[PDB]
Structure 1
Amino acid sequence: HMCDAFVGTWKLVSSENFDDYMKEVGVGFATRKVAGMAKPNMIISVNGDVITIKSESTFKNTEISFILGQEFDEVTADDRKVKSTITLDGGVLVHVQKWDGKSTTIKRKREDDKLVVECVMKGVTSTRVYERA
């Protein structure tokens, strides 16, 4: 019952400072443009201890399956090969990605009827808001 309030299909409704976040991460111009246009659906499901997060869009489709606290490999939408760990901290899903001596953290929180996603790279934070589809 760990992630019950996250489970479902969520559609992106707003984004703020994603371009800057992507620049900070090292994403090149053309990928920033196309990725920034996308309005992904985020599909979250749980089966036993395994959480699956799918992102489906016109740009890319991604899928991760993981157990909380257990590191895994992920290829991101912008093609970084990262080592990821996702944990729950006070009801927030905290996703850290490590690659090339760098790190980024992505936090997913339920707030009212939205799922709010904060992505931080160094001093740059982006906020993406999703609503139920």
Structure 2
Amino acid sequence: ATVQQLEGRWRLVDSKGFDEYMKELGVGIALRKMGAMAKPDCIITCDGKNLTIKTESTLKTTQFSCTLGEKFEETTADGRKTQTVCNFTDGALVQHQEWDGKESTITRKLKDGKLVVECVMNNVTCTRIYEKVE
């Protein structure tokens, strides 16, 4: 219901369709297997205006900060330069990515106290579940 319920550190506990989603993004099989094997924490921070999302695995960290509602450029882990906008809408944090006439949406919402992250591109959907650790 609020963005503050999404703030904190989350640990990945379940994943479904992530390989199909990365494949839809154009990610090579090597990066797909590395991404599938990773069990990253996700740290979400928000000061009212600025949203920061950090993804942390052993030896690998990526993080971006943006202003909610304002377009910005994202450098994704697979190496896309996207135009991205993050909004909080209808109880979910929605991250919309646009690049090369393509687009993808990552939605993060609270469900039964867990963080449910659904990544969509074209007609491929992936769902990843994290538990609160901090």
TM-score relative to the length of structure 1: 0.95
Deviations 1:73-117 (A, max 9, x none): 111111111110011111111111111110000000001110000
What does residue 110 of structure 1 align with?
110
Structure 1, unmatched stretches of 5+, are none
Map 1:24-103 → 2, pairs under 5 A:
24-58=24-58, 60-103=60-103
Question: What's the Cα RMSD here?
Answer: 1.4
Does the CA contact (< 8 Å) of 1:60 and 1:77 recur in 2?
A: no
1:129 and 2:129 correspond:
yes
Does the CA contact (< 8 Å) of 1:35 and 1:59 recur in 2?
A: no
Tell me, what secondary structure is at the counterpart of 1:79?
Answer: coil
What does residue 13 of structure 1 align with?
13
TM-score relative to the length of structure 2: 0.94
Structure 2, unmatched stretches of 5+, are none
Tell me, what secondary structure is at the counterpart of 2:35?
Answer: helix
Segments of 4+ in structure 1 off by > 6 A?
A: none
Tell me, what secondary structure is at the counterpart of 2:39?
Answer: coil
Distance 1:104 1:60 in 2: 23
Report the more deviating stretch, 22-31 or 40-49: 40-49
Q: Which amino acid aligns with 1:92?
A: A
Does the CA contact (< 8 Å) of 1:97 and 1:104 recur in 2?
A: yes
- Return the offset for 1:58: 2.8
Distance 1:60 1:33 in 2: 15
Count of aligned pairs:
133
